[PDB]
Amino acid sequence: AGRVLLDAEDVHAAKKSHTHEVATYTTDGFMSSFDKQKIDQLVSPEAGV
Amino acid sequence: SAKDYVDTIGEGTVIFKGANLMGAGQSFKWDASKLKFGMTLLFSRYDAANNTPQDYYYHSVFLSKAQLVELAGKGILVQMPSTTYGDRKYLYVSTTGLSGHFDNSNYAAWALRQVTIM
Amino acid sequence: TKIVKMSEKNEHGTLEQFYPETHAEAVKGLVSVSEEEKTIWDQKESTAGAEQKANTALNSAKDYVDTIGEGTVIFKGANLMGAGQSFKWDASKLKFGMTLLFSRYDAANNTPQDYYYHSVFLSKAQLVELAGKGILVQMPSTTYGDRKYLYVSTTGLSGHFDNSNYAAWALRQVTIM
Amino acid sequence: TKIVKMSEKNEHGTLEQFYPETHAEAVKGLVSVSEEEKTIWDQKESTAGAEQKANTALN
Ligand SMILES: [Fe+3]
Numbered sequence: 001a002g003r004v005l006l007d008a009e010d011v012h013a014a015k016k017s018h019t020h021e022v023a024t025y026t027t028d029g030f031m032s033s034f035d036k037q038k039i040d041q042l043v044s045p046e047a048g049v
Numbered sequence: 050s051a052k053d054y055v056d057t058i059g060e061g062t063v064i065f066k067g068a069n070l071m072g073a074g075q076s077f078k079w080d081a082s083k084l085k086f087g088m089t090l091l092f093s094r095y096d097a098a099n100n101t102p103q104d105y106y107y108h109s110v111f112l113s114k115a116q117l118v119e120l121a122g123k124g125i126l127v128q129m130p131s132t133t134y135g136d137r138k139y140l141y142v143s144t145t146g147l148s149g150h151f152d153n154s155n156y157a158a159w160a161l162r163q164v165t166i167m
Numbered sequence: 168t169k170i171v172k173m174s175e176k177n178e179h180g181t182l183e184q185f186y187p188e189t190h191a192e193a194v195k196g197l198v199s200v201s202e203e204e205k206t207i208w209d210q211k212e213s214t215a216g217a218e219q220k221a222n223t224a225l226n227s228a229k230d231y232v233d234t235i236g237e238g239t240v241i242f243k244g245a246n247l248m249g250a251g252q253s254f255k256w257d258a259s260k261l262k263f264g265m266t267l268l269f270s271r272y273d274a275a276n277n278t279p280q281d282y283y284y285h286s287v288f289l290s291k292a293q294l295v296e297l298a299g300k301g302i303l304v305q306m307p308s309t310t311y312g313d314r315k316y317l318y319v320s321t322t323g324l325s326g327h328f329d330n331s332n333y334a335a336w337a338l339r340q341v342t343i344m
Numbered sequence: 345t346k347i348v349k350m351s352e353k354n355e356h357g358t359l360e361q362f363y364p365e366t367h368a369e370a371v372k373g374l375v376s377v378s379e380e381e382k383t384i385w386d387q388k389e390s391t392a393g394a395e396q397k398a399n400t401a402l403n
Contacts, residue, residue: 024066037078037079041078110286113266113342114236114237115240115266116340119268119339123282134311137307168370170369170370185346185348187364188363189364193363193365194366195365195366196367198368198376204382204386207386211390211391212394216394220395221398221401224401228401
């Protein structure tokens with residue numbers, strides 16, 4: 001009661017600035033920065049015949 | 050905040066956890082700013098026929114930041130324990146990342162268990 | 168307190184409240200400001216200034232951490248570490264430890280090619296015990312051998328009269344951090 | 345309302361202005377200083393006072 005300060009905690013909600021764990025071999029999650037750093041440099045397959 | 054910063058540098062962030070022969074073609078890249086001290090590589094025993102990463106006979110190597118700068122994209126040879134001398138591993142290392150070589154496929158009995166940064 | 172709102176009756180029969188003129192010395196319970204401590208309270212210290220100073224201390228600590236992490240290269244180049252070769256530095260500069268790099272070499276053309284590098288690390292706790300007494304490092308090669316014996320201490324390292332025999336390899340760089 | 349200087353008739357036949365004796369709460373818009381906030385403001389922090397704390401944290 002009184003002056004009540006409500007944030008995402010007392011409602012058990014995710015923060016606006018929140019991040020999930022990176023995906024593992026058996027877990028689903030964010031894609032890691034170095035995963036993309038490996039992906040982009042990986043040249044696309046060459047289409048010949 | 051300073052304590053948290055130094056501790057987070059010390060504990061490091063895993064770059065790759067799993068197992069692979071680290072042969073020709075495979076490579077890993079990262080932002081250079083993530084490197085503050087160096088890189089660490091952990092290897093283990095492997096099975097060529099079964100392709101399952103046995104967990105024993107590990108071997109660790111550590112490369113510092115100054116050595117990393119001096120070895121920008123250069124070659125490093127790491128020997129590993131065995132019943133007989135051989136089964137070396139060749140890697141191309143750099144401050145931004147690492148690569149492989151077409152000799153680690155010959156020595157399929159051992160594989161790069163993991164690589165971490167700190 | 169007994170506060171009276173003094174007023175006056177205008178000749179029309181209307182009422183007008185008025186404020187008499189007074190002196191600061193007449194008012195009771197004034198608690199005045201002497202105009203001198205006002206500037207003192209003006210100087211003081213603001214929240215933003217303290218936040219900036221704390222952030223400056225934090226980023227100075229971060230810069231210290233980065234500098235100690237990157238380290239100083241004591242030697243870079245190529246050397247066989249034969250008899251008489253030795254490197255020296257300052258103990259206070261030694262913070263975490265030392266790293267040494269080796270690579271291939273030929274006594275024939277004296278050209279230190281860049282491949283087959285080997286790395287070795289020695290922490291400060293490793294180095295204090297290892298004061299004077301040397302270590303043996305075996306680097307990868309086709310045939311077993313080709314070792315280096317180095318009297319590595321917490322302030323200086325040296326060579327030995329065995330490394331000349333194994334001239335196929337050479338020390339590349341030694342760094343402290 | 346109007347602000348007035350109010351004077352009495354001194355026996356030499358003159359008008360002498362006199363300031364009535366008032367109290368702090370009697371005057372409007374006084375901006376009160378509690379005589380306790382003065383000590384608090386005096387304590388606060390000097391500019392050099394919050395410098396050795398940061399230097400100590402860095403050390
Ligand atoms: Fe989400």
